[PDB]
A paper describes a structure:
In this study, we have used cryo-EM to determine the 3.4 and 4.0 Å resolution structures of endogenously phosphorylated Saccharomyces cerevisiae Ycf1 in two inward-facing conformations: wide (IFwide) and narrow (IFnarrow). We designated the state in which the NBDs are further apart as IFwide and the state in which the NBDs are closer as IFnarrow. The R-domain encircles NBD1 in both IFwide and IFnarrow and is stabilized by extensive contacts along a basic groove of the NBD1 perimeter, intracellular loop 4, and the Lasso motif. The electrostatic interactions are supported by a substantial burying of hydrophobic surfaces at 3 sites (site 1: I621 - L802 - I902 - I904; site 2: F917 - I1123 - L1120; and site 3: L912 - I915 - I1154). These interactions are poised to provide a large thermodynamic driving force of R-domain binding and stabilize the R-domain/NBD1 interface, burying ~1550 Å2 and ~1283 Å2 of surface area along the entire R-domain in IFnarrow and IFwide, respectively (~546 Å2 (IFnarrow) and ~425 Å2 (IFwide) specifically between NBD1 and the R-domain). Instead, a rearrangement within the R-domain correlates with overall movements in the structure, including a change in angle between residues G913, G918, and G932 of the R-domain from 130° (IFwide) to ~137° (IFnarrow). In contrast to the interaction sites themselves, the major structural consequences of the IFwide to IFnarrow transition are induced at the ATP-binding sites. These sites not only move closer in IFnarrow but also rotate to occlude the non-functional ATP-binding site in NBD1. Notably, the second site in NBD2 (active) is open for ATP binding. Overall, these architectural changes resemble changes in substrate-bound and substrate-free states of the Ycf1 homolog MRP1. These movements support a model where R-domain phosphorylation helps stabilize NBD1 to recruit other domains into a conformation (IFnarrow) suitable for ATP binding and initiation of transport. The tighter assembly in IFnarrow compared to IFwide may reflect the end result of the transition initiated by R-domain phosphorylation that leave key components of the transport cycle (ie NBDs, X-loop, GRD motif) engaged.
Residue numbers in the entry: 17 to 124, 133 to 328, 341 to 851, 901 to 1258, 1268 to 1484
Write the structure that this text describes.
Amino acid sequence: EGFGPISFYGDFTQCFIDGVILNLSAIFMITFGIRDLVNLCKKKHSGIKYRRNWIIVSRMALVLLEIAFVSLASLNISKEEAENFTIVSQYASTMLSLFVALALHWIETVLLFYWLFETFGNFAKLINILIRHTYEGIWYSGQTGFILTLFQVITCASILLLEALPKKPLMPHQHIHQTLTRRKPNPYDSANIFSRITFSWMSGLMKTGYEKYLVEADLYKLPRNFSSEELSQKLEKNWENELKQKSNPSLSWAICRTFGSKMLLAAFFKAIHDVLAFTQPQLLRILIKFVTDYNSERQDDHSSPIVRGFLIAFAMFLVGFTQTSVLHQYFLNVFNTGMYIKSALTALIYQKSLVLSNEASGLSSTGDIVNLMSVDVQKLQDLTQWLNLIWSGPFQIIICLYSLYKLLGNSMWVGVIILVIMMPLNSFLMRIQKKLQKSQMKYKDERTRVISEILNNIKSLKLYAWEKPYREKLEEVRNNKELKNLTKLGCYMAVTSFQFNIVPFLVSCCTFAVFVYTEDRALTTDLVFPALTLFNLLSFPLMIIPMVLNSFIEASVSIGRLFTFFTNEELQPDSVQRLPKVKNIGDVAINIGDDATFLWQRKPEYKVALKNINFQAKKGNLTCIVGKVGSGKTALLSCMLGDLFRVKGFATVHGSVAYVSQVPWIMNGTVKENILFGHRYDAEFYEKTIKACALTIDLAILMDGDKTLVGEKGISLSGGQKARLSLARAVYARADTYLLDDPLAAVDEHVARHLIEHVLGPNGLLHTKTKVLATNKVSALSIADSIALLDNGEITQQGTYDEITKDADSPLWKLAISLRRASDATLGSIDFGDDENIAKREHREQGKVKWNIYLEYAKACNPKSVCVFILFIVISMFLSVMGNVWLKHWSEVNSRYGSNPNAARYLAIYFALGIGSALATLIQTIVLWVFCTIHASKYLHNLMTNSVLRAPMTFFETTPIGRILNRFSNDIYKVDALLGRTFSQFFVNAVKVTFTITVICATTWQFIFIIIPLSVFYIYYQQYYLRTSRELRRLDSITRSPIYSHFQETLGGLATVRGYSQQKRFSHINQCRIDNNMSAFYPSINANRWLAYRLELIGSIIILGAATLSVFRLKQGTLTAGMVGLSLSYALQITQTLNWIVRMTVEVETNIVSVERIKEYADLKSEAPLIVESQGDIKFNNYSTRYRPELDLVLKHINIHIKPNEKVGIVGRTGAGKSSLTLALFRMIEASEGNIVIDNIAINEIGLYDLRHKLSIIPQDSQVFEGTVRENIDPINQYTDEAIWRALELSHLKEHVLSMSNDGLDAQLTEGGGNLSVGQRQLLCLARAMLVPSKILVLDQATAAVDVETDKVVQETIRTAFKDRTILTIAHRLNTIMDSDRIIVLDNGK
């Protein structure tokens, strides 16, 4: 009688069954009875809380357990007749059941797992008794007690199912908990171990996503150990531990030590997966040996059992299931660790950036820090996926090669030489891949920069009508983009072909061709099929070895950047004391101590410092610091803000701070959100402020309500709008201490006169409280209650204007309530507002599943190319299957003829077959990429650019610039690469699945009945996952960008936010943002895990069906060992193929939806500007004119006539249709009721291009394009360089071209024109206008962006240069109003 784990029959013997049951019962009864009972009694004190319904299901489970224990006690008597170790198993099961009878009662996990092990043990014992009954008498072969052991088995199954499945209902008011119905709690908090591995909760979420499109409400709240606060504190404790033993690697040690446990668990699970994976080749080998030995046995019987095969099939199924469960648990743990890393690091970087020093901001550009927050944290999050894999790879390689050495033999390591010699080729190809990716990213960023540059001021581009050089340059860049993308496609296709071909075919065709005969031993079909499976498993380590090393190298750069960023210089707490509020009026509000001294230097003691200056401001006054550029005005103001390191002096600031910098700051949120800057609403005070500072016309001009979108991700706003918004925000922030740095600079001067009296002067709203307004305006100096002349960081004199006037006035003159404070907001919760705006566009369709869009893309490609691609894919798959089946035939021949190989002949045949399949895949991936794909990028981009270039001003003013900027740039890139990859992957995996199922059907006829239900299940899960993951990916893409945009904006307004002391609100907003992003990502990865689990379970069921049907065919009749080996070997490739193909399906769907969106952007039309059938010595006239958008009205009842050679000055009060006259004259809007006549010709009949080409505009703006000055002034090569030189000389800008442009007339320009002053840009626009030879000229806004000399120069230039050209000037200057021959008055509406 045997006693090992395997008997002569394949089943466990009785001894090993008792041993494993004893082990399971021992570990259960010790670990549950210690840990769970002690913890429950300690926490709950034997269950203080009696909350339980005591439903009948629990009593039924208890009674089932009791009757099972009774049956066990009854069967204990009979089995003890033999003298064996079964009494130990009986006693252990008795004690375990007796403990469980109380354990079930006490809880109202470990219990469930123990019941599963007990059920498996009873099932194994029953199978043993049935097998002995097959080998012996009918029923009572072993003993008569198996009939009640069946009752024990069914009782175990029933109690396991009835404990695992149903919930624990509670009677007394369970509904009271769910008060907050904004989001359901996640089911993950309430999920036992049986359901958690199966992810049934995600199946419920999948159903809810199937029946409804997901929104904020449908998603669940995150569970604990995911919010910002706990993760940030847990990282800060490890950061203090770094501060104990500070050094550069301390950041890495703190990060790893705070989350290393989950990575260790992931490592253990990966080890379990790796050791389990190679068992299946061994089971394949022993199955092949068993079937061929059984055929030999039957032949010997004819010359002179099935239980092994069935149990081997069951072993294969169990191996597949355990592999599935442990692998997906590993993936879940690793991605959870990455989520923790991202959530901690983003919050910590935000806090450190918020408390960062101003000098540190000066030493660190905004691009570097925002790129650090975007890429480096994402780099760590991505590297968390592959971090354990660097350890997993060598172990898998070592155990695979050990198994190969045991199987094949000694000194047969040609595969090792192929691996090690091919690895440097992989390294070189990965290097070229990285270089191509970096160059492509640089080119994409450059093209996006050019597009943003033109789109910032494309209104002026439309007016000048220089579109042809723009699109020509874009196509010129597109040529380089096309060739670089072609090179990337060629390299990627070569990499794909080498990865497909190099490992399996070449390594096999070397090793089993050579070393089988070189060792003098027949193949006999046991070697090559396990060898082929081993090579297929070993393919992944070859690519995995160099891949993770690149990101591992990048991790050093990322962690070094993070470490220097963290340990960069902070600022001291003691720069200034923000004391309590101001007392009753008279004492002090602000004080800088005696001989105070400050600087922008603490460590090295740079020269940037001021020394020995004091300051004092009385309560309720207006002060003004007056000084030139570099005077130390900004230094003194920032010192008052406390943003400096003091070296000497006493700084006390009373009350609260309100501050406006010279550069206005605007948040991404709406104008309502900006003006209501985290404060409770107050309607009358809001109306008072908006009346006093701004105007209601300033709200009306926005073409939207108060909830309009700010120009950062909305409609662009002019500088005066920004200044008025900043002043409105400041005055709405009712505060004690007030600070303004030239807010009137970026607005009209006569409107600045309205500003000073209404809000600042003694009638002003904030009259009785201290305010500093630093400006060099004479009206401000006259009205101000104190003046401080400052220069070079040292005050010269201070006092009242009375004190100034007494001595020589040279050095400045010749050169009972306190408004009840403000009131902050309550720090509320905030959703992601971007969802509804795109939901408006998505509302058109809800069943977008028809493939008309796919056939449209097919028409947009060459369909013959698609047919050739399909045929090439099928040819490659057929060649591979032919190679495998011919290998089966050759191995069967070698099995029949004992050691009589046609070795060279079949070596040549197999080499030809494999290299033919590899070349077919090569020609598929290389050439047809070039034909269909870049044709698509070229054509889709040409149509999109052609449509969007000719778009109307209604589209430009309505749609945001940023919205079409991101979609035009990003989505064109996604269709270029990702779509072309994913279509190929989808078709390859589809054809692979079809051929695998076809050969399996060829193995046995009756497989269609088993494959049909599994195919239905597969289609069901694919539909559910697609309709969920589409919306989840959309939400994830939505929530990513607002975090980085908010980081950029709060960095830009660092001074203003730190002055306003709203640091808590911004921190809470960042925490809410990352919480929303985590909520919009965790269901996505868990949905991926759920789908991959169920698909791999389907693959394991396919393995079981193939094996058991093969054994059934074996029992039914003759069966070849090679056919079974081939069928099982092809069956083993199912799981990875299905798990990839569904994901590629949803990716193709997402890419096609993006293609439809950008095509919808391309779905636009406008008027035809082309020539279809004109200056000087001609009259001009307008009659009955009307031209505005349909939703508004400005122009009506206008009849005017202008003779040639007359100058016109237009005058109008604010809002009286000023710019509409210019746009009507240019005929920018196609709507034209009436007739405008020039040269006795109606303007609308001809077109737009020639008319715009034959006029001159000064658009009130001076920002121009980047690039060469000659290209900017004269993009089309009109006439020479001497002409523009003369125009520049007449415009009097010789100084700039003399200073710069040393190489020639080719000086470069920074984009946006900020490198040079606005007056010089105005001179450049003047020079361009004078270069334009047209008589019609439009001039606008001469009285709001000039410094007197510019106005005189342009007035004399338009006077003397255009002696007779018709000039219409729209301005407020008295001189140009008087000098005009005919003053046209701009009526309010007609």
